[PDB]
């Protein structure tokens, strides 16, 4: 139980896993993680593991990161393949992660850490 993932996260620190990790993710997976810390705090995001389906535009499988509390504002990047994306630091107290896999081809998945940064 199961292909369940995401929600809102307000703790100082957490490691997000792709559903099933360390098993490969499944097809047709969508997950949203919304990080919200205290006003004045920022988010240091780091990639422990990253292995998704690869294609030139990441049109199939991807993890998207937003420097905001939605998946509309402050788009920082879209990632796939087996390269570890560089660390991401938020400009504010909010960050949004979206994972999507399409109908075919799976890979190892990911573990992504965030930690609070104080002023
Ligand atoms: Ca796929
Ligand atoms: Co606007």
Residue numbers in the entry: 131 to 249
Give the exact sentences the study uses for this entry.
TSG-6 is a 35-kDa (single chain) protein composed mainly of contiguous Link and CUB modules that are flanked by N- and C-terminal sequences of 18 and 29 amino acids, respectively. TSG-6 was shown to play a direct role in the transfer of HCs from IαI onto HA via the formation of covalent intermediates (HC1·TSG-6 and HC2·TSG-6) and act as a catalyst in this process. Hyaluronan is organized into a cross-linked network by the cooperative action of three proteins, inter-α-inhibitor (IαI), pentraxin-3, and TNF-stimulated gene-6 (TSG-6), driving the expansion of the COC and providing the cumulus matrix with its required viscoelastic properties. Here, we have determined the tertiary structure of the CUB module from human TSG-6, identifying a calcium ion-binding site and chelating glutamic acid residue that mediate the formation of HC·TSG-6.
This revealed it to have a classical CUB-type jelly roll fold, with a greater degree of similarity to the metal ion-binding subclass of CUB domains (C1s, MASPs) compared with the non-metal ion-binding spermadhesins, and, consistent with this, it contained a divalent cation at the site we had predicted. The metal ion-binding site in the TSG-6 CUB module consists of seven oxygen ligands with pentagonal bipyramidal coordination geometry. This is composed of the main chain carbonyl groups of Ser-234 and Val-235, monodenate coordination with side chain carboxylate groups of Glu-183 and Asp-232, and bidentate coordination with the carboxylate of Asp-191 and a buried water molecule, an arrangement highly suggestive of Ca2+ (or perhaps Mn2+). However, no magnesium ion-binding sites were discovered during the refinement and analysis of the TSG-6 CUB module structure, despite the presence of 200 mm MgSO4 in the crystallization conditions. The Glu-183 residue, which is involved in chelating the Ca2+ ion, makes a major contribution to the non-covalent interaction with HCs of IαI (e.g. via their Mg2+-containing MIDAS motifs), which precedes formation of the covalent bond between TSG-6 and HC. In particular, it probably orients the functionally important Glu-183 amino acid residue, allowing it to interact with the HC.
